[PDB]
């Protein structure tokens, strides 16, 4: 069963470097060339690079020529894409893919993708604000606003995981400031607002920050 496993993604500032890896299994590694194809947020597929089955040819898209290099280690069944002098427009999900034949053919197996984010923003923990229940049909909506953090991801639980039904945590928005915001809301019985405590647990691992915000 052909299987491709990518790693090495992450978040960097412009001008820095990243090295992606593609670990292969289930085929004779050195009989196949390996490609990289990327996808900017919201946009189509863009071919990036190829290394030939025998490492004898390496080609790169004009958009990355001179900045990217590629290598293969047949001992470890792995391909490495070295990305130097990264630019914000290099932000993308990067896929490795196996080519069926020795050039001029098609990509028959694809990895699951490695996320690469190139941004001038600096790591920042969130400001968490309660979204208090106020004044639909016996149920109340309350939530927390997770404001101005960087980078993704943030996770949210309620009551340390004891409250799961009626929870909806929304995907974040990326703002013009370069920081993110997201919200999590739960619907509960109006009658419970005087007797039950509601706390949202916000975890931002990239800044080693956790916030437990009491709502109401």
């Amino acid at each position: 069963q052909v299987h491709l496993v990518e790693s090495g993604g992450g978040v960097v500032q412009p001008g820095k470097s990243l090295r992606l890896s593609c670990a292969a299994s289930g085929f004779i590694f050195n009989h196949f060339g390996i490609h990289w194809v990327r996808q900017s947020p919201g946009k189509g597929l863009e071919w990036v690079a190829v290394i030939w089955y025998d490492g004898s040819k390496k080609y790169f898209a004009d958009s990355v020529k001179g900045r990217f290099s590629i290598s293969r280690d047949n001992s470890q069944n792995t391909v490495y894409l070295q990305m130097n002098s990264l630019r914000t427009e290099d932000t993308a999900v990067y896929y490795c893919a196996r080519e069926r034949w020795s050039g001029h053919s098609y990509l028959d197996y694809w990895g699951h993708g490695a996320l690469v984010t190139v941004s001038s923003a600096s790591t920042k923990g969130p400001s968490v604000f309660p979204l208090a229940p106020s004044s639909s049909g016996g149920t109340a909506a309350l939530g927390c606003l997770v404001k101005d953090y960087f980078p993704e991801p943030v996770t949210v639980s309620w009551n340390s995981g004891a409250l799961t039904s009626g929870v909806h945590t929304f995907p974040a928005v990326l703002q013009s400031s370069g920081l993110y915001s997201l919200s999590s809301v739960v619907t509960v019985p109006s009658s419970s607002l005087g007797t039950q405590t509601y706390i949202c647990n916000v975890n931002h691992k990239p800044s080693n920050t956790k916030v437990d915000k009491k709502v109401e």
């Binding site: 189509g44 597929l45 069926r100 098609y106 694809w110 309660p130 979204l131 606003l145």
Partner: protein, 209 residues
Amino acid sequence: SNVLTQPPSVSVAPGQTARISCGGNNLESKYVHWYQQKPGQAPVLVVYEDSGRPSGIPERFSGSNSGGTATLTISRVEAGDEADYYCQEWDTSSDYPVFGGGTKVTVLQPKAAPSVTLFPPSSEELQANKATLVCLISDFYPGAVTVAWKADSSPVKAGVETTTPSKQSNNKYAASSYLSLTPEQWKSHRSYSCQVTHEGSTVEKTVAP
């Protein structure tokens, strides 16, 4: 160099046949391959060498390359066929392959109006000299909304940040929108509103200081 041209989008009713064209030069003499990419997933090969069907691809997907045009035909369309489809060639004379820009196939499914919840700024944020209104939009279908804000009855564009819709567990869509204000702007108006338009109908929620 060579370019492959595909239509940006195709709409098709469940059970009907979708046809995606791929134009380029001298396709009589070249292989054209096709890839499927469903939202949030990696691409998958769905046609190789004009008409070959890869392992795991339904028989309803059929590639062809005839008269200089390559076509992916999806027969008896299912909702699960909603995806972006890309054609690809690799000329003898080119060091690298060429992809088309992709065709988005949407499958024509029970509509649902959005639920809208609007929260005013918290007192905590206001005493930190900031103000954010939060508009949460859930359970709508198809996945396209437009979001407008108003201060009293005047449209507001500055300070607005809105997500693109994303699919929920139940196959409906959700989105959110944020309006950033100064405290003085929040306190100086009678009300603010989040208006969500969907398939021509609007759901509007209002809050007041």
